[PDB]
Amino acid sequence: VIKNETGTISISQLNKNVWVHTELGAVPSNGLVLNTSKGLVLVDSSWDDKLTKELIEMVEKKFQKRVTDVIITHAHADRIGGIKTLKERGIKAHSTALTAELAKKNGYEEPLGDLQTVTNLKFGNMKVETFYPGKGHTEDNIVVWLPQYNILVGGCLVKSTSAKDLGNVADAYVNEWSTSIENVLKRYRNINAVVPGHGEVGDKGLLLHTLDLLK
Ligand SMILES: [Zn+2]
Numbered sequence: 001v002i003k004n005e006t007g008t009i010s011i012s013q014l015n016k017n018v019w020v021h022t023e024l025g026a027v028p029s030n031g032l033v034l035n036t037s038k039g040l041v042l043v044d045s046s047w048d049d050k051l052t053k054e055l056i057e058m059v060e061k062k063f064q065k066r067v068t069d070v071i072i073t074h075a076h077a078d079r080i081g082g083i084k085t086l087k088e089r090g091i092k093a094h095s096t097a098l099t100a101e102l103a104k105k106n107g108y109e110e111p112l113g114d115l116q117t118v119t120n121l122k123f124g125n126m127k128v129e130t131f132y133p134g135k136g137h138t139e140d141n142i143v144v145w146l147p148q149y150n151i152l153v154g155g156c157l158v159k160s161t162s163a164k165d166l167g168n169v170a171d172a173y174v175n176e177w178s179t180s181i182e183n184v185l186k187r188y189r190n191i192n193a194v195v196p197g198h199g200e201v202g203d204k205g206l207l208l209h210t211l212d213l214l215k
Contacts, residue, residue, distance in 0.1 A: 002062065007054055011062075012201075015149050017126065020195060021059075023051050029078055029198055032144070032153050033059055038124030039068035043144045043153045045082040052082025056089070067091055069123065071130060072111050073155035073197075074141045075102035076171070083109045094121075096132055098140040115142070131187060133157070134180035135173035137197070143184055150192040157181065159210045160199020166213055167198075178214050181207050 003010035008024030011033060019033040023046045032043035040059055045052040056067045070086055072079050072095040080103045086093045093111035095103075100113030121128040129145040137156040144153035157180065159166070166172065185207055194206045 002058075004054070004058060007051075009051070009054060009058060011059065014151070014193065014201070018146065018149060018151060020201060021055060023047060023055065025078070027198055030195055032195065034123065034126055034128070034146070035063055035065075036123040036126040039066050041123050041126065041128065042067060042070045044073055044079050044155070045070050045086060047078050048081045049085045052085045055082075056085070056091075069094060071095070071115075071121075071128070071144055072099055072103075073144070073153070074138045075099045075106065075108070076138060076156075077106075079155075080106075080108050080111070083111065094130070096130075096140060096142060098132075099142070102138075102140055131184070133183035133187075134176050136177035136180040137167075138171045139173060141180075145188060150188075150190055151195070152184070152188060152191050152193070153195045154184070154197065154206065156197035157184075157210070158194060158196045158206050159213055160196035160206060161202060161209060162199045163196075163213070174214060178211055181210055181214075 001012050010022050012020045017035040021031045021033050022028050034041040069092040087109050095111035096115045097113040100110045104110045115130045117132045119130040132142045141157045191204050194202050
């Protein structure tokens with residue numbers, strides 16, 4: 001549970017090799033910091049470059065290793081915003097082809113577009129699975145699964161126990177969103193914890209909570 005001084009960044013621990021990163025904008029977004037024997041892996045970066053830089057520098061210093069990869073969960077500014085920083089420092093920015101094309105169309109530098117519907121990644125000792133469940137918060141939103149701990153990073157497809165709204169539904173697919181959440185529940189039937197795009201960590205109850213919000 002290491003927070004910065006002023007800047008708006010904090011890092012909470014869950015496992016011996018998994019932490020949560022939260023950054024303020026008017027809404028505090030979440031992400032993941034995975035400590036592996038080959039380097040640090042992030043599930044999402046931050047709102048912009050300035051925040052993304054501070055974030056990388058904070059964890060590299062703490063864990064004594066380099067951030068080598070980042071997985072972008074969708075193309076919105078809050079997730080793709082620090083792409084320039086990632087690209088110039090040589091950090092691999094993974095994403096689906098869809099997320100990659102949406103970032104470009106919106107004027108952002110593009111991530112790798114290497115991820116499929118189900119992609120199995122392995123970082124030294126760590127194993128990470130990416131999964132596209134269908135449209136919801138956006139047309140491209142994906143979730144991240146850590147099998148070794150049964151942890152799920154839901155991104156903005158999943159709302160926390162504090163969200164009484166669906167948020168910005170401008171690029172959302174409110175109809176398929178319920179089916180997409182069901183795809184996640186069907187694929188991962190035993191979840192230990194769930195990390196929402198915004199809000200506090202939870203469990204399977206976050207998905208059911210999102211389903212109710214979609215009614
Ligand atoms: Zn979004």
